[PDB]
Ligand binder design. Structure first.
Ligand SMILES: [K+]
Ligand SMILES: [K+]
Ligand SMILES: [K+]
Ligand SMILES: [K+]
Ligand SMILES: [K+]
Ligand SMILES: [K+]
Ligand SMILES: [K+]
Ligand SMILES: [K+]
Ligand SMILES: [K+]
Ligand SMILES: [K+]
Ligand SMILES: [K+]
Ligand SMILES: [Mg+2]
Ligand SMILES: [Mg+2]
Ligand SMILES: [Mg+2]
Ligand SMILES: [Mg+2]
Ligand SMILES: [Mg+2]
Ligand SMILES: [Mg+2]
Ligand SMILES: [Mg+2]
Ligand SMILES: [Mg+2]
Ligand SMILES: [Mg+2]
Ligand SMILES: [Mg+2]
Ligand SMILES: [Mg+2]
Ligand SMILES: [Mg+2]
Ligand SMILES: [Mg+2]
Ligand SMILES: [Mg+2]
Ligand SMILES: [Mg+2]
Ligand SMILES: [Mg+2]
Ligand SMILES: [Mg+2]
Ligand SMILES: [Mg+2]
Ligand SMILES: [Mg+2]
Ligand SMILES: [Mg+2]
Ligand SMILES: [Mg+2]
Ligand SMILES: [Mg+2]
Ligand SMILES: [Mg+2]
Ligand SMILES: [Mg+2]
Ligand SMILES: [Mg+2]
Ligand SMILES: [Mg+2]
Ligand SMILES: [Mg+2]
Ligand SMILES: [Mg+2]
Ligand SMILES: [Mg+2]
Ligand SMILES: [Mg+2]
Ligand SMILES: [Mg+2]
Ligand SMILES: [Mg+2]
Ligand SMILES: [Mg+2]
Ligand SMILES: [Mg+2]
Ligand SMILES: [Mg+2]
Ligand SMILES: [Mg+2]
Ligand SMILES: [Mg+2]
Ligand SMILES: [Mg+2]
Ligand SMILES: [Mg+2]
Ligand SMILES: [Mg+2]
Ligand SMILES: [Mg+2]
Ligand SMILES: [Mg+2]
Ligand SMILES: [Mg+2]
Ligand SMILES: [Mg+2]
Ligand SMILES: [Mg+2]
Ligand SMILES: [Mg+2]
Ligand SMILES: [Mg+2]
Ligand SMILES: [Mg+2]
Lengths: 53, 235
RNA sequence: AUAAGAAUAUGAUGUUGGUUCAGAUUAAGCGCUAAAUAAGGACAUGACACAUGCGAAUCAUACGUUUAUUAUUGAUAAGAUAAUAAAUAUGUGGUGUAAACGUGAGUAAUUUUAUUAGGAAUUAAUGAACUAUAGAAUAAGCUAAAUACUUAAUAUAUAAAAAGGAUAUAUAAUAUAUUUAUCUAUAGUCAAGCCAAUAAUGGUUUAGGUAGUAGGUUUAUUAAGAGUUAAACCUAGCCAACGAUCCAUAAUCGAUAAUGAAAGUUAGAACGAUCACGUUGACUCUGAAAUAUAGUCAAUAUCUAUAAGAUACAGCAGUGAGGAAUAUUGGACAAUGAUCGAAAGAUUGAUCCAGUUACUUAUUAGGAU
RNA sequence: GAGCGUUAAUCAUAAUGGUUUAAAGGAUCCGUAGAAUGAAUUAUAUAUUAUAAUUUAGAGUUAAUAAAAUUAAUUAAAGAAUU
RNA sequence: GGAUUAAAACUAGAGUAGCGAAACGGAUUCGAUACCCGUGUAGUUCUAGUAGUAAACUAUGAAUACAAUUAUUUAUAUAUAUAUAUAUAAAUAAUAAAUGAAAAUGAAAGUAUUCCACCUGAAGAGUACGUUAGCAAUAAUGAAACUCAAAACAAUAGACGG
RNA sequence: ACAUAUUAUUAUCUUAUUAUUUAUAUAAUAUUUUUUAAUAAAUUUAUUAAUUUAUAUUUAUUUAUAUCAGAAAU
């Protein structure tokens, strides 16, 4: 018998799916939004570079 | 993984669900340039209270269970401690029975000796009446009684000789038979080994298959097993 | 891998045995002496007391407030409205000070340090503040007004939110567009809480210690285990001559410094890591995290404004004291960072430089005849 | 040598030691712990250790035979001499 | 940790011839709180205890493996042409080797292994203080400061010796 | 001996503050609630001030426990 209130087995290792990690962390813009603004364009370029990196 | 240790249970039954386990680990002592064993006693959780003092157990790290308890019993490698408890209980019953039987065999022996001390008749005198009545023809009722004191219904010269037999006599004949067997076994094997042809035949006669193709030790044992199967089984 | 001994006993000899010396070094002081330059350091003592000036501000594009001009209105000029250009940070607001810097008092470890390819309770509806993506941003009240605060609406058992400002254009205050903010959700990044194993000075002329003490059960509390805290009920344990308990002393450590052939020993100034503290003690608030250099009360000292007041230089410089002994009441935000701001920019005794001082190192300090 | 000396300190400079007679064998033995040490063969294992089986050279038990009359405790006696 | 532990000493009850601290006398002597003599108390003896100290010494902890000889005893065994002879151990004595400062050790003080106790200049000091134990005397445990460059052992040649 | 200073402890005494926990109010505020005046608007309704009613949030006093600190003893 293992101690009462304790887990008999060790917690399961968490394996990372790189495809899912990329999908949740750096997901692509869902629509091709209209970045006519000067600041929107700069932000779009920065977001693209960060996602590529 | 969780840190596991091996240790000997050194205390049990003093705390509820807790045992003390002695863990020895190997360390190097730089000062004396020697690899030493370092000992420490661990308070260990025993959920099922199965472990007993003397058992060899493996303890596994767990969550904090108390101020000083951080390990639990994970497996009983050897259960010598549990065996001790079982053998002690059985011993009390086993010894009581034997002592009772021996006490009854002592009182019986005492009674027999006391009964014999109540019979003034003595072996010498009784054997002097069975040898005078058998040489004179008189048959006083004492003889009939003597035929009951000893069970010797018939009074002949070959009945007093069987009343006075000593165990030593039997031992002397058993010893001669024992000596004969050993001497015969040795002479038989000694002769067999001296003659390889008679040896090969000997093995085949007793049921060996191609004894010729055998080693000295692999075949001398067969000869010894056979010589001791031809002088101890037939007798 | 790199390992040297010498002097001193004795009448003399051999040996035992201590003492001293030969080497290197410093967080050094002192005596005598002293040229320039470059670089590295500088209160080890009283966590003693501190005159004076500085070390934390910033935003006017959150809300108010104040001018000037022009136009319209006001049949006489007090005011109003809009545009433009300025002012206001002694009004309400936002962000910033849990960092950095300084110090080493406490701390010998239920707490601190170091280490491990350690662990679970199998750690919160925590983002602190940037990144990627998606969505939202509603109604009243209170204040003079608001991106202040309060109460509601709607948003992943479901719970739990918000905020506008600036600038254009079109409309009749509204709508878009640009720009900068606000809230929520998911992941990442950074960053947290807890536990185990091992090691960490001296004294037993401190030998017995412990009574929540050791273990079990249950509830409260917490994101979370556990006599961690509080409450209840049981068992009689737990530590200890391989040194318990107690007492004294001390911040710890390194790929740092010193020394040695090396194992080691020493230091813990300087460089870096960690801990603790900001006159003393306790407590509370906010928050993911604080017994916070905050607040509250008390203690000690000082001060002026005499208030249920302010201050506490272990921030920089500096002064007195102590001591054998350790420096400028310097310059600059040019560089590297940090905070505020949409930006323009503002601030910065962090920092960068210089000054003082042979404290250390290095170079130079005239060659041929 | 722009230092030199001196004081205060640190490291190194002999345990690749000793205890009859020079510092140092505990009065003696028994025996607990020892994180002290300790036989043989073979087979496994994760290996100078563990486990299992097996063995008799250390250490013991019981007899047989021979030998010895001591050492403890207790009780009962003797002897020379002395006053 | 435990047990045992000379002599002296101590606590009780006996005993007390001889011996004999002390004490009191006699001598000796410059003096004689001594050596010698006398009277001689405790003690020396026994029983029941306390205490755990000695130059308690072989000044040498215990155990195991091993190494060259002789002599002399002792024990066991063997043999005979019966009283010796031949073997294997123990003890003791003198040694080889080895060790050691040497004196010497000699089956250890040699070659090795295992465990325990103990030592780190002299003096201060086995003292002070504390603690523990004891009826007590005491026993165990056990420092530091100050001072010094000493202190000690074996051996050598002398000098000296009532 | 002892006179001092420092620290620690407590079956003791006093205790700031705080946390938790009691009891109380003709306590305050908001809402609800029962009525009652005054006022106002319109021609019943609203507002204000009271009373009743519960509810939540506070406030004052109070009970108990713990607590900086000081006193006393050791
Ligand atoms: K528990
Ligand atoms: K010397
Ligand atoms: K702004
Ligand atoms: K400072
Ligand atoms: K410190
Ligand atoms: K906007
Ligand atoms: K200690
Ligand atoms: K700057
Ligand atoms: K010696
Ligand atoms: K006498
Ligand atoms: K010994
Ligand atoms: Mg020197
Ligand atoms: Mg110098
Ligand atoms: Mg400089
Ligand atoms: Mg200082
Ligand atoms: Mg404005
Ligand atoms: Mg303001
Ligand atoms: Mg800080
Ligand atoms: Mg803050
Ligand atoms: Mg600095
Ligand atoms: Mg809105
Ligand atoms: Mg509003
Ligand atoms: Mg707000
Ligand atoms: Mg003392
Ligand atoms: Mg506790
Ligand atoms: Mg619990
Ligand atoms: Mg309790
Ligand atoms: Mg300190
Ligand atoms: Mg160190
Ligand atoms: Mg240190
Ligand atoms: Mg410094
Ligand atoms: Mg603090
Ligand atoms: Mg403080
Ligand atoms: Mg404060
Ligand atoms: Mg200060
Ligand atoms: Mg300063
Ligand atoms: Mg001075
Ligand atoms: Mg200096
Ligand atoms: Mg000056
Ligand atoms: Mg400045
Ligand atoms: Mg130089
Ligand atoms: Mg050395
Ligand atoms: Mg020795
Ligand atoms: Mg001895
Ligand atoms: Mg001795
Ligand atoms: Mg034997
Ligand atoms: Mg004697
Ligand atoms: Mg007597
Ligand atoms: Mg006299
Ligand atoms: Mg006289
Ligand atoms: Mg006399
Ligand atoms: Mg005795
Ligand atoms: Mg003595
Ligand atoms: Mg002695
Ligand atoms: Mg003797
Ligand atoms: Mg023995
Ligand atoms: Mg003594
Ligand atoms: Mg001598
Ligand atoms: Mg207190």
């Amino acid at each position: 018998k293992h101690p009462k209130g304790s887990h008999r087995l060790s917690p399961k290792v968490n394996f990372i799916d790189v495809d899912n990690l990329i999908a949740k962390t750096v997901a692509e813009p869902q629509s091709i939004k209209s970045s006519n603004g000067s600041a929107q364009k700069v932000r779009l370029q920065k977001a693209e570079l960060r996602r590529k990196f | 993984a969780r840190q596991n240790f091996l240790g000997l249970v050194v205390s049990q039954g003093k705390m509820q669900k807790t045992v003390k386990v002695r863990v020895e680990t190997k360390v190097f002592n730089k000062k004396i340039n020697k690899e030493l064993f370092h000992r420490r006693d661990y308070l260990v959780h025993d959920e099922g209270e199965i472990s007993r003092e003397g058992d060899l157990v493996r303890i596994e790290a767990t969550r904090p269970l108390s101020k000083r308890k951080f390990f639990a019993i994970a497996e009983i490698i050897r259960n010598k401690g549990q065996q001790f408890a079982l053998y002690e209980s059985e011993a009390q019953l086993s010894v009581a029975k034997e002592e009772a039987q021996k006490a009854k065999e002592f009182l019986d022996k005492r009674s027999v000796r006391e009964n014999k001390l109540n019979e003034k008749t003595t072996l010498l005198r009784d054997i002097r009446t069975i040898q005078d009545a058998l040489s004179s023809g008189s048959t006083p009722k004492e003889l009939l009684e003597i035929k009951q004191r000893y069970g010797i219904q018939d009074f002949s010269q070959e009945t007093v000789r069987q009343l006075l037999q000593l165990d030593i006599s039997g031992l002397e004949v058993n010893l001669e038979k024992q000596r004969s067997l050993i001497d015969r076994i040795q002479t038989r094997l000694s002769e067999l080994l001296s003659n390889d042809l008679k040896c090969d035949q000997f093995l085949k006669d007793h049921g060996v298959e191609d004894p010729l193709t055998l080693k000295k030790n692999i075949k001398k044992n067969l000869l010894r097993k056979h010589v001791m199967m031809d002088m101890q089984q037939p007798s």
